[PDB]
Amino acid sequence: AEPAQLRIGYQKAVSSLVLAKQHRLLEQRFPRTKITWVEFPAGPQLLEALNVGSIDLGGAGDIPPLFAQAAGADLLYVGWVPPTPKAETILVPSKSALRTVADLKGKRIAFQKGSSAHNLLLRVLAKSGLSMRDITPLYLSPANARAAFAAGQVDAWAIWDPWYSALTLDGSARLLANGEGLGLTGGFFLSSRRYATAWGPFVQQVMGTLNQADGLLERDRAGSIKTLAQVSGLPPAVVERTLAHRPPASVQPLSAQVIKAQQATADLFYAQRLLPKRVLVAPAVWRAP
């Protein structure tokens, strides 16, 4: 037996999950399983849905699961997605006086709370003697943060591609700093405990397939650009710029150093009084037989 249903969460931003969904790669591989793709605006949204059973497999950044674990979610890390530091950014309105990270002190900074942008921001700010309490957070999902930025209500926005490329290409934004040199973890695939326990091998095979979907970003450059352009709405030039910011990042098993990295992030968040619990990553880590 393979399960009857896989309701799997994705974010449109993760170009490789868009393509797998478009090329119906899971469906091709698992013909006896109803594959249902459910889109979320970011990670924390996605994790809250895994928590209540709306999906049971989904991809997010490194922070969403830590926010979920701390609130009491019972998830499994089942796959790790390598970081793409150039695609994680702090943007400012191109008109703005701000040119260095130091200039962020006392400014309003939009970002998805609990998202990878929240950790990019803490860690960028740290290299300049700033912390979360030197800046004002505007906790806003990407579309709502975009609207506030276009309206002049934010001083800076921590956000990922496609928005970075979109706003820098159209003149809306300057890059203030990206995620290079912070030793970012990356992201994860999360699962419900029951589903990954019941259907381990299937969950591994799901990863095998999504892994090959990431491969299309480089092995099908010209085709990826069209489909993505077509699917997102974005111009091809922008989709091309987003592919330039992304080395391969194919989902594969959690290595030892990644687990420790995620624990170190958990510690740092707790230490900075941004999580109420100390989160233990390791008991939630899973690998198939």
Side-chain angles (χ1 to χ4, degrees), residues 90 92 96-109 120-131 133-136 155-156 174-177:
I90 312 203
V92 284
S96 145
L98 308 185
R99 322 200 96 74
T100 64
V101 165
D103 293 324
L104 304 172
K105 184 189 173 285
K107 305 305 169 132
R108 280 163 179 237
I109 314 186
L120 174 95
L121 176 64
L122 202 222
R123 297 282 331 281
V124 167
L125 289 187
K127 303 237 137 163
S128 284
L130 287 181
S131 79
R133 66 200 141 29
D134 306 294
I135 69 82
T136 307
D155 287 312
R174 261 176 306 109
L175 176 77
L176 201 64

mmCIF file of all heavy atoms in Angstrom, residues 90 92 96-109 120-131 133-136 155-156 174-177:
data_model
loop_
_atom_site.group_PDB
_atom_site.id
_atom_site.type_symbol
_atom_site.label_atom_id
_atom_site.label_comp_id
_atom_site.label_asym_id
_atom_site.label_seq_id
_atom_site.Cartn_x
_atom_site.Cartn_y
_atom_site.Cartn_z
ATOM 1 N N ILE A 90 17.362 41.780 2.444
ATOM 2 C CA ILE A 90 16.823 42.957 3.016
ATOM 3 C C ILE A 90 16.805 43.952 1.869
ATOM 4 O O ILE A 90 17.870 44.343 1.334
ATOM 5 C CB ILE A 90 17.698 43.437 4.157
ATOM 6 C CG1 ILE A 90 18.042 42.265 5.133
ATOM 7 C CG2 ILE A 90 17.010 44.660 4.908
ATOM 8 C CD1 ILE A 90 18.458 42.840 6.671
ATOM 9 N N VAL A 92 15.341 47.891 0.569
ATOM 10 C CA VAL A 92 14.804 49.161 0.902
ATOM 11 C C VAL A 92 14.279 49.840 -0.362
ATOM 12 O O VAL A 92 14.726 49.533 -1.528
ATOM 13 C CB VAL A 92 15.840 50.156 1.560
ATOM 14 C CG1 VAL A 92 16.070 49.771 2.975
ATOM 15 C CG2 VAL A 92 17.155 50.271 0.724
ATOM 16 N N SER A 96 15.246 55.616 -0.854
ATOM 17 C CA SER A 96 15.529 55.778 0.550
ATOM 18 C C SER A 96 16.952 56.239 0.844
ATOM 19 O O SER A 96 17.866 55.996 0.065
ATOM 20 C CB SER A 96 15.250 54.421 1.201
ATOM 21 O OG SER A 96 16.125 54.127 2.244
ATOM 22 N N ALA A 97 17.129 56.927 1.962
ATOM 23 C CA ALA A 97 18.481 57.304 2.433
ATOM 24 C C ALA A 97 19.329 56.130 2.948
ATOM 25 O O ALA A 97 20.566 56.284 3.068
ATOM 26 C CB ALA A 97 18.361 58.355 3.557
ATOM 27 N N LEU A 98 18.696 54.994 3.278
ATOM 28 C CA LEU A 98 19.401 53.868 3.932
ATOM 29 C C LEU A 98 20.290 53.167 2.952
ATOM 30 O O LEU A 98 19.785 52.715 1.936
ATOM 31 C CB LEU A 98 18.392 52.831 4.491
ATOM 32 C CG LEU A 98 17.270 53.347 5.406
ATOM 33 C CD1 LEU A 98 16.441 52.186 5.956
ATOM 34 C CD2 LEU A 98 17.766 54.265 6.533
ATOM 35 N N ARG A 99 21.587 53.042 3.256
ATOM 36 C CA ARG A 99 22.519 52.319 2.384
ATOM 37 C C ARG A 99 23.305 51.199 3.093
ATOM 38 O O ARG A 99 23.807 50.282 2.431
ATOM 39 C CB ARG A 99 23.487 53.281 1.667
ATOM 40 C CG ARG A 99 22.812 54.585 1.245
ATOM 41 C CD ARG A 99 23.580 55.287 0.179
ATOM 42 N NE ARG A 99 23.044 54.965 -1.133
ATOM 43 C CZ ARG A 99 21.903 55.445 -1.627
ATOM 44 N NH1 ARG A 99 21.107 56.280 -0.916
ATOM 45 N NH2 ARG A 99 21.547 55.061 -2.839
ATOM 46 N N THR A 100 23.388 51.248 4.420
ATOM 47 C CA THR A 100 24.095 50.173 5.153
ATOM 48 C C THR A 100 23.148 49.573 6.199
ATOM 49 O O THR A 100 22.132 50.195 6.608
ATOM 50 C CB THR A 100 25.316 50.696 5.982
ATOM 51 O OG1 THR A 100 24.796 51.581 6.983
ATOM 52 C CG2 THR A 100 26.390 51.415 5.127
ATOM 53 N N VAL A 101 23.529 48.389 6.684
ATOM 54 C CA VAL A 101 22.739 47.731 7.736
ATOM 55 C C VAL A 101 22.649 48.599 8.986
ATOM 56 O O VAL A 101 21.588 48.719 9.556
ATOM 57 C CB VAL A 101 23.302 46.318 8.053
ATOM 58 C CG1 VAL A 101 22.740 45.820 9.355
ATOM 59 C CG2 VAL A 101 22.938 45.386 6.950
ATOM 60 N N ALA A 102 23.740 49.259 9.365
ATOM 61 C CA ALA A 102 23.669 50.235 10.439
ATOM 62 C C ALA A 102 22.533 51.234 10.364
ATOM 63 O O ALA A 102 22.000 51.658 11.417
ATOM 64 C CB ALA A 102 25.020 50.964 10.664
ATOM 65 N N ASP A 103 22.151 51.624 9.147
ATOM 66 C CA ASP A 103 21.132 52.655 9.013
ATOM 67 C C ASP A 103 19.702 52.150 9.438
ATOM 68 O O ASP A 103 18.777 52.951 9.607
ATOM 69 C CB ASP A 103 21.058 53.117 7.551
ATOM 70 C CG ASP A 103 22.308 53.849 7.076
ATOM 71 O OD1 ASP A 103 22.902 54.598 7.890
ATOM 72 O OD2 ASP A 103 22.639 53.746 5.850
ATOM 73 N N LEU A 104 19.524 50.830 9.537
ATOM 74 C CA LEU A 104 18.248 50.190 9.975
ATOM 75 C C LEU A 104 17.829 50.512 11.421
ATOM 76 O O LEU A 104 16.658 50.360 11.756
ATOM 77 C CB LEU A 104 18.242 48.661 9.743
ATOM 78 C CG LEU A 104 18.514 48.239 8.292
ATOM 79 C CD1 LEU A 104 18.687 46.701 8.130
ATOM 80 C CD2 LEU A 104 17.458 48.753 7.383
ATOM 81 N N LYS A 105 18.752 50.970 12.274
ATOM 82 C CA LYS A 105 18.389 51.290 13.690
ATOM 83 C C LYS A 105 17.203 52.262 13.740
ATOM 84 O O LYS A 105 17.176 53.293 13.028
ATOM 85 C CB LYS A 105 19.617 51.853 14.477
ATOM 86 C CG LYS A 105 19.441 52.133 15.937
ATOM 87 C CD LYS A 105 20.683 52.882 16.436
ATOM 88 C CE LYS A 105 20.530 53.346 17.846
ATOM 89 N NZ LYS A 105 19.622 54.538 18.007
ATOM 90 N N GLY A 106 16.206 51.925 14.579
ATOM 91 C CA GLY A 106 15.015 52.752 14.697
ATOM 92 C C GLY A 106 14.079 52.713 13.514
ATOM 93 O O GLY A 106 13.138 53.470 13.514
ATOM 94 N N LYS A 107 14.292 51.828 12.518
ATOM 95 C CA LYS A 107 13.437 51.801 11.313
ATOM 96 C C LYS A 107 12.350 50.713 11.398
ATOM 97 O O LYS A 107 12.501 49.720 12.125
ATOM 98 C CB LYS A 107 14.252 51.501 10.050
ATOM 99 C CG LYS A 107 15.416 52.411 9.808
ATOM 100 C CD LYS A 107 14.917 53.849 9.793
ATOM 101 C CE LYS A 107 16.105 54.812 9.829
ATOM 102 N NZ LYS A 107 15.859 55.800 8.774
ATOM 103 N N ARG A 108 11.275 50.897 10.642
ATOM 104 C CA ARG A 108 10.251 49.853 10.492
ATOM 105 C C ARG A 108 10.590 48.821 9.380
ATOM 106 O O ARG A 108 10.764 49.150 8.228
ATOM 107 C CB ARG A 108 8.926 50.515 10.189
ATOM 108 C CG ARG A 108 8.300 51.024 11.396
ATOM 109 C CD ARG A 108 7.212 52.040 11.044
ATOM 110 N NE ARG A 108 6.652 52.440 12.327
ATOM 111 C CZ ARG A 108 5.371 52.356 12.705
ATOM 112 N NH1 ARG A 108 4.420 51.955 11.867
ATOM 113 N NH2 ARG A 108 5.039 52.762 13.937
ATOM 114 N N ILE A 109 10.672 47.574 9.772
ATOM 115 C CA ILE A 109 11.065 46.521 8.876
ATOM 116 C C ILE A 109 10.009 45.436 8.777
ATOM 117 O O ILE A 109 9.751 44.690 9.730
ATOM 118 C CB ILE A 109 12.378 45.890 9.329
ATOM 119 C CG1 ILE A 109 13.372 47.011 9.692
ATOM 120 C CG2 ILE A 109 12.872 44.865 8.234
ATOM 121 C CD1 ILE A 109 14.758 46.505 10.010
ATOM 122 N N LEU A 120 17.205 35.707 8.825
ATOM 123 C CA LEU A 120 18.157 36.512 7.949
ATOM 124 C C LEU A 120 18.337 37.864 8.609
ATOM 125 O O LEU A 120 19.431 38.340 8.811
ATOM 126 C CB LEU A 120 17.598 36.790 6.588
ATOM 127 C CG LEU A 120 18.571 37.724 5.873
ATOM 128 C CD1 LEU A 120 19.509 36.941 5.024
ATOM 129 C CD2 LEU A 120 17.849 38.703 4.997
ATOM 130 N N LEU A 121 17.229 38.461 8.992
ATOM 131 C CA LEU A 121 17.256 39.787 9.600
ATOM 132 C C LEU A 121 18.017 39.885 10.960
ATOM 133 O O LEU A 121 18.875 40.710 11.126
ATOM 134 C CB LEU A 121 15.836 40.314 9.658
ATOM 135 C CG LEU A 121 15.598 41.647 10.327
ATOM 136 C CD1 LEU A 121 16.349 42.801 9.507
ATOM 137 C CD2 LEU A 121 14.091 41.876 10.393
ATOM 138 N N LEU A 122 17.722 39.001 11.895
ATOM 139 C CA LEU A 122 18.384 38.928 13.198
ATOM 140 C C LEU A 122 19.908 38.807 12.992
ATOM 141 O O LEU A 122 20.712 39.529 13.655
ATOM 142 C CB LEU A 122 17.870 37.692 13.924
ATOM 143 C CG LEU A 122 17.888 37.451 15.446
ATOM 144 C CD1 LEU A 122 18.303 36.024 15.831
ATOM 145 C CD2 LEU A 122 18.616 38.460 16.255
ATOM 146 N N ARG A 123 20.300 37.910 12.103
ATOM 147 C CA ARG A 123 21.719 37.590 11.851
ATOM 148 C C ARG A 123 22.448 38.672 11.063
ATOM 149 O O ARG A 123 23.621 38.871 11.288
ATOM 150 C CB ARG A 123 21.921 36.329 11.030
ATOM 151 C CG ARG A 123 21.441 34.967 11.610
ATOM 152 C CD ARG A 123 22.372 34.370 12.677
ATOM 153 N NE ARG A 123 23.803 34.733 12.526
ATOM 154 C CZ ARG A 123 24.660 34.165 11.657
ATOM 155 N NH1 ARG A 123 24.236 33.188 10.869
ATOM 156 N NH2 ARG A 123 25.923 34.582 11.564
ATOM 157 N N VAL A 124 21.770 39.326 10.110
ATOM 158 C CA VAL A 124 22.352 40.498 9.425
ATOM 159 C C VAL A 124 22.524 41.647 10.420
ATOM 160 O O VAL A 124 23.604 42.258 10.507
ATOM 161 C CB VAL A 124 21.470 40.940 8.161
ATOM 162 C CG1 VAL A 124 21.858 42.294 7.658
ATOM 163 C CG2 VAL A 124 21.661 39.925 7.021
ATOM 164 N N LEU A 125 21.476 41.919 11.195
ATOM 165 C CA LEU A 125 21.525 42.995 12.172
ATOM 166 C C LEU A 125 22.657 42.790 13.181
ATOM 167 O O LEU A 125 23.341 43.770 13.580
ATOM 168 C CB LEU A 125 20.185 43.142 12.900
ATOM 169 C CG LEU A 125 18.958 43.715 12.147
ATOM 170 C CD1 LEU A 125 17.797 43.939 13.096
ATOM 171 C CD2 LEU A 125 19.370 45.049 11.625
ATOM 172 N N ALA A 126 22.830 41.542 13.616
ATOM 173 C CA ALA A 126 23.882 41.172 14.600
ATOM 174 C C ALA A 126 25.313 41.552 14.201
ATOM 175 O O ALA A 126 26.110 41.897 15.077
ATOM 176 C CB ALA A 126 23.832 39.644 14.913
ATOM 177 N N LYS A 127 25.615 41.519 12.904
ATOM 178 C CA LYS A 127 26.958 41.740 12.395
ATOM 179 C C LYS A 127 27.293 43.207 12.481
ATOM 180 O O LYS A 127 28.464 43.599 12.281
ATOM 181 C CB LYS A 127 27.116 41.214 10.968
ATOM 182 C CG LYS A 127 26.784 39.756 10.846
ATOM 183 C CD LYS A 127 27.925 38.927 10.269
ATOM 184 C CE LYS A 127 28.074 37.645 11.036
ATOM 185 N NZ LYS A 127 28.908 36.583 10.290
ATOM 186 N N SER A 128 26.273 44.016 12.834
ATOM 187 C CA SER A 128 26.385 45.446 12.952
ATOM 188 C C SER A 128 26.029 45.967 14.330
ATOM 189 O O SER A 128 25.822 47.160 14.501
ATOM 190 C CB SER A 128 25.523 46.134 11.909
ATOM 191 O OG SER A 128 26.195 46.015 10.662
ATOM 192 N N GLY A 129 25.974 45.080 15.317
ATOM 193 C CA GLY A 129 25.652 45.520 16.653
ATOM 194 C C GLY A 129 24.213 45.894 16.859
ATOM 195 O O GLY A 129 23.858 46.520 17.844
ATOM 196 N N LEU A 130 23.370 45.471 15.928
ATOM 197 C CA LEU A 130 21.959 45.689 16.066
ATOM 198 C C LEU A 130 21.257 44.373 16.431
ATOM 199 O O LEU A 130 21.768 43.300 16.180
ATOM 200 C CB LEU A 130 21.390 46.298 14.799
ATOM 201 C CG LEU A 130 21.795 47.774 14.624
ATOM 202 C CD1 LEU A 130 21.188 48.323 13.364
ATOM 203 C CD2 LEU A 130 21.314 48.551 15.811
ATOM 204 N N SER A 131 20.091 44.465 17.029
ATOM 205 C CA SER A 131 19.291 43.305 17.285
ATOM 206 C C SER A 131 17.829 43.632 16.968
ATOM 207 O O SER A 131 17.462 44.760 16.559
ATOM 208 C CB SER A 131 19.441 42.846 18.755
ATOM 209 O OG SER A 131 18.650 43.655 19.661
ATOM 210 N N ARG A 133 15.565 44.265 18.929
ATOM 211 C CA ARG A 133 14.952 45.360 19.657
ATOM 212 C C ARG A 133 15.556 46.740 19.271
ATOM 213 O O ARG A 133 15.292 47.742 19.951
ATOM 214 C CB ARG A 133 14.972 45.121 21.161
ATOM 215 C CG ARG A 133 16.344 45.113 21.757
ATOM 216 C CD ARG A 133 16.309 44.382 23.151
ATOM 217 N NE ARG A 133 17.514 43.567 23.289
ATOM 218 C CZ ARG A 133 18.662 43.871 22.694
ATOM 219 N NH1 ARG A 133 18.772 45.000 21.981
ATOM 220 N NH2 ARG A 133 19.701 43.065 22.811
ATOM 221 N N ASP A 134 16.363 46.786 18.204
ATOM 222 C CA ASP A 134 16.790 48.090 17.700
ATOM 223 C C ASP A 134 15.937 48.551 16.498
ATOM 224 O O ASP A 134 16.128 49.686 15.986
ATOM 225 C CB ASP A 134 18.269 48.136 17.344
ATOM 226 C CG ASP A 134 19.175 47.696 18.487
ATOM 227 O OD1 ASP A 134 19.230 48.394 19.512
ATOM 228 O OD2 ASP A 134 19.827 46.633 18.330
ATOM 229 N N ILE A 135 15.005 47.690 16.076
ATOM 230 C CA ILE A 135 14.203 47.934 14.860
ATOM 231 C C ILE A 135 12.762 47.689 15.179
ATOM 232 O O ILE A 135 12.509 46.919 16.074
ATOM 233 C CB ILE A 135 14.695 47.023 13.677
ATOM 234 C CG1 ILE A 135 14.385 45.529 13.923
ATOM 235 C CG2 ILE A 135 16.218 47.133 13.547
ATOM 236 C CD1 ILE A 135 12.990 45.094 13.576
ATOM 237 N N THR A 136 11.818 48.322 14.453
ATOM 238 C CA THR A 136 10.391 47.968 14.559
ATOM 239 C C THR A 136 9.916 46.980 13.501
ATOM 240 O O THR A 136 10.025 47.279 12.312
ATOM 241 C CB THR A 136 9.519 49.198 14.493
ATOM 242 O OG1 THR A 136 10.006 50.094 15.482
ATOM 243 C CG2 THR A 136 8.017 48.822 14.744
ATOM 244 N N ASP A 155 10.403 50.710 5.936
ATOM 245 C CA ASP A 155 11.639 51.389 5.711
ATOM 246 C C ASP A 155 12.481 50.365 4.984
ATOM 247 O O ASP A 155 13.412 50.707 4.266
ATOM 248 C CB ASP A 155 12.261 51.827 7.077
ATOM 249 C CG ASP A 155 11.514 53.021 7.722
ATOM 250 O OD1 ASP A 155 11.251 54.030 7.002
ATOM 251 O OD2 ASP A 155 11.183 52.969 8.944
ATOM 252 N N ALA A 156 12.150 49.087 5.183
ATOM 253 C CA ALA A 156 12.941 47.977 4.690
ATOM 254 C C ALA A 156 12.061 46.736 4.823
ATOM 255 O O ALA A 156 11.190 46.679 5.702
ATOM 256 C CB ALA A 156 14.248 47.803 5.555
ATOM 257 N N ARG A 174 16.229 48.823 -3.777
ATOM 258 C CA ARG A 174 17.655 48.463 -3.655
ATOM 259 C C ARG A 174 17.861 47.326 -2.655
ATOM 260 O O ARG A 174 17.202 47.269 -1.631
ATOM 261 C CB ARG A 174 18.547 49.635 -3.152
ATOM 262 C CG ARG A 174 19.295 50.400 -4.224
ATOM 263 C CD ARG A 174 20.040 51.587 -3.602
ATOM 264 N NE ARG A 174 19.204 52.525 -2.775
ATOM 265 C CZ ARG A 174 19.284 52.623 -1.437
ATOM 266 N NH1 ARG A 174 20.100 51.857 -0.719
ATOM 267 N NH2 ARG A 174 18.574 53.507 -0.797
ATOM 268 N N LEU A 175 18.829 46.475 -2.952
ATOM 269 C CA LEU A 175 19.278 45.453 -2.003
ATOM 270 C C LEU A 175 20.065 46.149 -0.887
ATOM 271 O O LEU A 175 20.984 46.936 -1.138
ATOM 272 C CB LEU A 175 20.137 44.426 -2.766
ATOM 273 C CG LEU A 175 20.803 43.292 -1.972
ATOM 274 C CD1 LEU A 175 19.775 42.305 -1.671
ATOM 275 C CD2 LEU A 175 21.942 42.644 -2.685
ATOM 276 N N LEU A 176 19.704 45.924 0.350
ATOM 277 C CA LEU A 176 20.540 46.405 1.449
ATOM 278 C C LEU A 176 21.575 45.368 1.866
ATOM 279 O O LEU A 176 22.618 45.755 2.343
ATOM 280 C CB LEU A 176 19.706 46.768 2.682
ATOM 281 C CG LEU A 176 20.345 47.715 3.693
ATOM 282 C CD1 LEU A 176 20.552 49.027 2.986
ATOM 283 C CD2 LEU A 176 19.474 47.994 4.860
ATOM 284 N N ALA A 177 21.237 44.062 1.788
ATOM 285 C CA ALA A 177 22.102 42.948 2.235
ATOM 286 C C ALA A 177 21.400 41.687 1.830
ATOM 287 O O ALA A 177 20.167 41.624 1.947
ATOM 288 C CB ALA A 177 22.276 42.905 3.775
#
